[PDB]
Amino acid sequence: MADITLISGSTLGGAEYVAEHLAEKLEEAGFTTETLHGPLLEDLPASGIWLVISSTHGAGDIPDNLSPFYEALQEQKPDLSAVRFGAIGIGSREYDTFCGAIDKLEAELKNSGAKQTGETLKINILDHDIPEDPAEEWLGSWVNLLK
Template identity: 30%
Template sequence: MSAVILYGTETGTGELVADAIADVLAADHDPSVYDMAEFAVEDLDANDFLVVVCSTYGEGELPSSALPFADELDEEKPDLAGLRFAVFGMGDTVYGDTYNKGGEIMAAKLTELGAVQVGEHFRHDASSAVKPAKAAEEWAQSLPALIEQD
């Protein structure tokens, strides 16, 4: 099964995280990495495993590169039954109630359309000493087992 990694970012960190996840999955799952701004909702395929990498921007909003994809999900309302996905969210605990909202917003949009979230919804904290790409590499070690499940 192929893995599709979509990232939403404001500063570029999401792309670095997506690339780190792709490196872990490269041996067995032929990952493809796309900026959400450049990925069409109609290209979502239940035969792929979806990994969503999403930062949080402003006051708990989606980053600018995630907005076109999120808006298209809202407008098209595709049936995503059968699509399985995992989420790596990014945020900063100094923002309290809005910490990691970007990943949560994307997860909610996908599940509302019938997709199923699997595995740990990772929430990276920018205030921690752990770099996001390093945390993503460690988190991604659990993905091959999830991808192989039916």
């Protein structure tokens, strides 16, 4: 049981460690969360809050990066107009628009109806990776905006 699904599984696997840290900070913010590698694509329905925790930029695999999830999104394009999402760790944004437009992932969610709120959250720990720099300040902003 959660108010937010933490969909953390680019290739049916992903940054579950970072998603668990995010999930804990989101429960501390006053909510309940479900750290998942998206085993059902959408454990919470097309209503509520979603978050998507993937690394589409310098580690975005060949097709797009989200091999099962992207095809599943296009297959059903559910009425996400009653939910909002936040991309996290994703680098497609504005900034790795660089060899193509793998922003397709964000675009198809927005087409299906989920507003992106704020802008893509950036996460980092121990060793530099893809978005380079943590954004607990995004988490504070996005929370006090949604309150």
